[PDB]
Amino acid sequence: MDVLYSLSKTLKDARDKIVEGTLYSNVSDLIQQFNQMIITMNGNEFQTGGIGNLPIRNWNFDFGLLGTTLLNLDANYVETARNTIDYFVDFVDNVCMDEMVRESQRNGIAPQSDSLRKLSGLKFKRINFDNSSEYIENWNLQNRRQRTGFTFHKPNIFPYSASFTLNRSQPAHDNLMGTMWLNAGSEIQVAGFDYSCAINAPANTQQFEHIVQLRRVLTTATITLLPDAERFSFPRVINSADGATTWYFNPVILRPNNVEVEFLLNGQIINTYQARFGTIIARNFDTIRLSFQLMRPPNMTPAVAALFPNAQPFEHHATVGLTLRIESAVCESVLADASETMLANVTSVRQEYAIPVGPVFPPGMNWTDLITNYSPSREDNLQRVFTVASIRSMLVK
Amino acid sequence: MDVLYSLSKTLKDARDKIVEGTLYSNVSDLIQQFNQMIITMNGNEFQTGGIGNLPIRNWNFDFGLLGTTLLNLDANYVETARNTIDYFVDFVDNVCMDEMVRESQRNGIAPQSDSLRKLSGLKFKRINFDNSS
Amino acid sequence: MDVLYSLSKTLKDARDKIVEGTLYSNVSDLIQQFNQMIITMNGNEFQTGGIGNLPIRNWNFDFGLLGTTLLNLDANYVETARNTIDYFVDFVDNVCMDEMVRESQRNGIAPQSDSLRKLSGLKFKRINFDNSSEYIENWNLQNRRQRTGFTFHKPNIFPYSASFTLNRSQPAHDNLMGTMWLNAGSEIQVAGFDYSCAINAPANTQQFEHIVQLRRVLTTATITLLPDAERFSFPRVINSADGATTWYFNPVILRPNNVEVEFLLNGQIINTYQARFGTIIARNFDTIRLSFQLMRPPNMTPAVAALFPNAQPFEHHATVGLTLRIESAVCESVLADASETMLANVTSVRQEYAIPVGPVFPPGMNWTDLITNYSPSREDNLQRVFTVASIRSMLVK
Amino acid sequence: GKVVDSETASICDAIFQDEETEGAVRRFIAEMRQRVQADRNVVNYPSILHPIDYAFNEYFLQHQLVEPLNNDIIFNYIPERIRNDVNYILNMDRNLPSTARYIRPNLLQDRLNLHDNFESLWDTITTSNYILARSVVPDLKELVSTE
Amino acid sequence: FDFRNSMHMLTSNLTFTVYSDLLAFVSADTVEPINAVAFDNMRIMNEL
Ligand SMILES: [Zn+2]
C-alpha cells in the first residue's frame, strides 16, 4: 500500500520538475529516488483486470536508466523520459482501478488484487518517499494507531431524512401539533407547529425538540444557526402517517422562543447555546439536540388576533423553526463532503466499468445507505478505497 | 515566533518523508536541518501551562543525533526516531495551547508565554525555514 | 498430521517470543528449531483448493535463514522476520481449510488433501515438537491404541428430543397420564402428569420413569439435579399423538416423590441417588434413568381438595418433574460442548466456501443428526476435522 | 566464530575476562558467528567500533563507487559512430565473470566557462590539445617523387 | 563505555576483481586502406 503512494508523488514531483531547461541540481535528490524504482521493477510480470468490463492488460518491464551526466536538461532528455513515464501513468491507472472495486468482509482494511497483494511484498518497500499528501499522512497514523483526522467543507454526516411526527392529531387533521424536518448532508431544518397556537397550553407555550444522532463524532465544527425553517414555511398538502389520506399545513411563522442547542458527546453536554444565532463552535459531539418553543403572542394587533381564534377551525397554523448548517468540521473517519471528489471517483470508476454489487458497499455506493449503517467494515473499505482515489487524482483527474 | 513555525514543517516534512525504505538522498538536505535543531535545544529547560484546567507539564532535552550514514533506511532506524519525535509532538501541542490563550491590550500582537518569550530569543533563530504555509 | 501441529506452535511460540527487545539466549533453543523447517521446505511446491468456492492457490518456497546474532533484538531483525512469517500464516490457513472438508468412508480417519497427503511424507517428519496442546496430546495417544479423553463442558450429548408418551388417554384427552420431556445438549427435563391425581391408583401413587441412552459414555460428570420441570409447569395446548387434534394440559405442581436417579453402564448401576438434589457425581455411564412418583396428598386444605375431585372433570392436572444438567464431563470421543469452537469452526468453513454435502456428515454438520447416528466413520472424520480446527485456531481465530 | 578485524578481536578476548561484566557478555561474544552466504556474495561479519566510527566506515560501504560490467558496457564506452563505420572491425574474445567491476569515468562537461575570459590558459590548452593531435594524425604514404 | 551500543553488524560484499584501462578486451582489425568509405558509402579515395 504505502508503496503505491510513492509511485505517484514520484511521477507528479516528476512530470512536474522535469522540463526543457532547469539545472540538474533541482533533481539530483530526485533523479536518484526515481532510478532506484526502475531497478526493483524490471523483470516482474503484472496482471490487471478480470472483472466486469475491465480490460486485462498485461505489463512487462525492461527500461533503461537516467544518465546524471548533464547540467541543463536538453529537450532531447525530456522526450526520452516522458515516453518512459507514459507507461507508468497508463499503468497505475489500470492498477488503482483494479483494487478500487474488490471488497472483503473479514479483512476489508487490507489489499486484495493480484496486482497489489504482490506490492505489499517486501522486496518492493525500497521505494516509499515524501508522504505529505493529507490522505497518506492519515493512512499511516492509523496503522501504528493514534489521533488520526481530516478536513471537510460542508461534510456529509446526516443521512437523508425528511419526515414529521404528529404529537397531537385526529382523523380530520384540523388541529395538529408536532414537528417536521429535513436532515441531509451537513444541514438540519426543523419546524414545530401547533394549529391551536398554544391556546390551551400551560403558559401558552408549546415545547418542541429535535434530536439528531451522528454516526461519527465531529470535532472542531464551525456551525451556522439561524431562526426559522424556510423549507417548512409554506403551504403543504402532506400524506398522513398511515398513508391513507392527506392533511393541510398552512403555516404562519413566529420567532422560536427559548432556543437551546446542545452538542452532546456520549450523553454529556459539551457545548450549549441559548438563543445564539449566527456562527457558533461545537468542539466535539456525536449528537445535536435542538429545543425551541412556540409561545402564543400575549399582545396581538387585530390582524394577528384574527389568525388565532379561541375555537376551531384553526386556519393559520403557528410555526416556529431552526436551521443549522455545519460549514466545516474534522472527523476521525472518512466521510463525503461538498469539496472532495473521493466518493465521486470511487462511485464513478465502479459505474463506468459495470462493477457488480459486492458484499460490503450498498448498491451504487449510495451515501445515505452507507452512512446510515456505517459499519467498521464499510469504513475500513471506504478509507482504503478513498486513499486510493486520492493517490490516483495526483496524476489522473 | 517564526521559530515556532519551523518546529513543525520540520516534523511534518519529517514524520512524512521518513518511511521504512526510502533511499537516503531524498532527505540529506532534510536530516541536516533536523539535527541542527536538537543541538540548539538540549540543555534548556521549559515550562508550560498554569491556568484554568491547563496542566503544568515540565520538559527537558538530551538527545542523540541521527546517523546520516546508511544508504537505505532500515526499519530499526525509523523506530529509534519516531520515539524521539513523539516527545516533540506531545511538546509543541502543550506549547501552542499555552500561548493560544494569553492576551494583552497593549502589545497583544507579540509573544506572551514564558515558553515563547524565550523562543524569540536570538540563540534560537538558528532554525527558520520553508515558510510556504 | 503431527507434522501440521508443529508448523503452528512453531509460529505462535514464534510470533510471540520474538519482539523488539528480548535478550539473545531466550530464543536459542527456538531459533534453531525454526530454521530446520525452512530447509526441509524450500523446493517443494504446494496446492490448495479445487472444491466449491475454494480459491485454488499455489505456494512456493525460497526464504533465507537468519542473522542468528545481535544481542537485544533490533527492530530491523523483527520486520525482516514477520514478513517471512506472514507467508506461512496466510499459508497454513489455506492448508487447514483444505483438509477441513474432505470426507472418506472406508478409511476416513486418515489424511485426504493433495496438500496433506504430501505432509505425512517421511522427509518432513524432521519437525514435530511441543505437543502440550490438549488436542494433539490426545491425537497421539489415540494412534497408540491407548485411553484418555478430553475435558468438556455443559457438553452436547443429547440429540434434541421434545415429546410425550400418554400411558392412559382417551379421545377427549380429559383424563391423561404419562410423561413429556426435553432432552437437549447437556440437559434433561421430564414431567410425569396424572389428570386423576392418583385417585384410583394403588397407594394413591403413580409411578413415572424416564430413560435416556447416551450415544457415548461420559465419565467424571458433575451434575446438577433439581426437583420440578419448569418447562412443563405451564398451560399448554398440544397436538395429539396422531396429529388429528389438540389436548389441553393445565399443570399444578407437587414435589416428586421417591426420586431415584441411576447412572448405568452396560445395564449395571454405577451410581444411584435417592432424592438427592443439588450437585451429584456420575463417574462412568452410558444411560441415565430417572424414576419418580406422584403421590396424591393424604391431607389437603380446602383450596387443595378443590383441585382434586373424586370424579371428572379433572381440571387441574397433577404434575411432578425433574431437571438434570451435566455441567462438565470427560468423553473418550470428541463432542460439541458449550465452550469449544471446533464444531462451529468446521461448520463455518464449510458454509463459507459452499462445500457440497459429502458421504459422511449430515447436511450442515447438523449436531442432532450427527450425534443421533454417531457412527465410527463420523467420529473418526469428526476427530480429524476437530483436531485440524484446533490447529488452525492457534493462529487464526 | 570468526570476527571483523584486529581491534574487534582484542577487545573481546580482553573483556571476556574482566570478571565484572554480565554473564550475558560472554554469551553474546560466544555463540555469535559470522555470516557466510556463498551464492549472492553476502558477508555479514560481527563487529565493534563506536558510534562515531561506525558512522565513518559505514558510508564507505554504502558508497562503494563500483558499478558492474557486461561485454555490452565495454562495447558501449564506444562512440555511437565507428561501430557504424564498416571500415572498422569489432569483435569479442574474453568472457565476463559476474564479478566484473569498474570505476565511473566522471565526465561532467565544462562546468567552468573559461572560454570567455581565461584566454591566457586557453592558449595553453589549445597548444596542448594541438601537439596531442599531431602525435596522432597518421603519416602519409606513396607520394610523387619530389624531383 | 556501553558495549551493546557500540557493537554493530556489517554489510560487506564479497570477492570482486577491479579492472582498469579497460578497452584492451577489444579485438579489432582493419580493412585494407585501398577500401575506405566515408559516411558517403561510395568510397573515399576512389581515383584508382
Ligand atoms: Zn459456563
Across the B:C interface, residue pairs with CB atoms under 8 Å apart total 16
Report domain extents, chain C: 1-158+329-397, 159-328
What resolution in angstroms, rounded to 1 decimal? 5.0
Q: Which residues of D touch B67 (CB under 8 A)?
A: 51, 54-55, 58
Please identify which residue in the block is written with the cell numbers 438434589. C277
Annotated binding residue C62: no
Beta bridge partners, D53, equal none
Cα–Cα distance, A292 to A191 (Å, whole number): 9
Instruction: Say which DSSP state D17 is in.
Output: T
Backbone angles phi, psi at C319, to 5 degrees: -135, 135
Chain breaks in chain C (C to N over 2.5 A) after: none
Cα–Cα distance, A189 to A184 (Å, whole number): 9
Beta bridge partners, D45, equal E10
Instruction: Say which DSSP state D91 is in.
Output: B
Q: Which of A139, A138, A141, A128 is nearest to A3 (CA)?
A: A128
Which residues fall within 8 angstroms of residue D56, CB to CB, at 6 or more apart? none
| Dist. CA C327 → ligand 1 center (Å) | 8
Cα–Cα distance, A9 to A133 (Å, whole number): 9
- For C67, the closest of E4, E7, E9 (CB atoms) is E9
Please identify which residue in the block is written with the cell numbers 584501462. E21
Ranges assigned E (strand) in chain E:
9-12
B100: exposed, middle or buried (Cβ count in 10 Å: 0-12, 13-18, 19+): exposed
A385: exposed, middle or buried (Cβ count in 10 Å: 0-12, 13-18, 19+): buried
Q: Record the cell numbers describing residue C392, joined without a space.
A: 488452525
Name chain A's partners: 3 or more CB pairs within 8 A.
B, D
Contact C71 E4 (CB under 8 A): yes
Q: Work out whether strand C257-265 and strand B58-59 pair parallel, antiparallel, or are unpaired.
A: unpaired
Do C351 and C336 contact (CB within 8 A), yes or no? Answer: no
Experimental method: X-ray
Annotated binding residue C266: yes
Beta bridge partners, C161, equal C183
Cα–Cα distance, A329 to A220 (Å, whole number): 5
Cα–Cα distance, C179 to C162 (Å, whole number): 11
Instruction: Say which DSSP state A245 is in.
Output: -
Contact A286/B at CB under 8 A: no
Cα–Cα distance, C157 to C336 (Å, whole number): 8
Same fold, C1-158+329-397 and C159-328: no
Distance from CA of B16 to the nearest CA of C (A): 20
- CB environment A107-136: b (16+ within 10 A), e (fewer): ebeebbbebbebbbeeebbbbbbbbebebb
CA atoms within 13 A on the CB side of A369: 7
Please identify which residue in the block is written with the cell numbers 496486482. A115
**What does CATH list as the number for A159-328?**
2.60.120.170
D84: exposed, middle or buried (Cβ count in 10 Å: 0-12, 13-18, 19+): exposed
Torsion angle (degrees, nearest 10) of CA C141, C145, C147, C150: 50
Q: Which CATH architecture has domain C1-158+329-397?
A: Orthogonal Bundle (1.10)
Contact C67 E7 (CB under 8 A): no
- CB environment A284-323: b (16+ within 10 A), e (fewer): bbbbbbbbbbbbbbeeeeeeeeeebeeeeebeebbbbbbb
Cα–Cα distance, C46 to C60 (Å, whole number): 7
Distance from CA of A124 to the nearest CA of D (A): 19
Which residues fall within 8 angstroms of residue B105, CB to CB, at 6 or more apart? none
Cα–Cα distance, B14 to A140 (Å, whole number): 13
Q: Record the cell numbers describing residue C339, joined without a space.
A: 465452550
Q: Can you tell me whether residue A304 is helix, strand or coil? A: helix
Q: Which of A218, A238, A234 is nearest to A321 (CA)?
A: A234
Three-state SS for B58-104 is EECCCCCCCCCCCCECCHHHHHHHHHHHHHHHHHHHHHHHHHCCCCC
Distance from CA of E21 to the nearest CA of D (A): 10
Q: How many CB atoms lie within 10 A of CB C30?
A: 14
Q: Record the cell numbers describing residue C35, joined without a space.
A: 530454521
Cα–Cα distance, A116 to A46 (Å, whole number): 10
Do A163 and A176 contact (CB within 8 A), yes or no? Answer: no
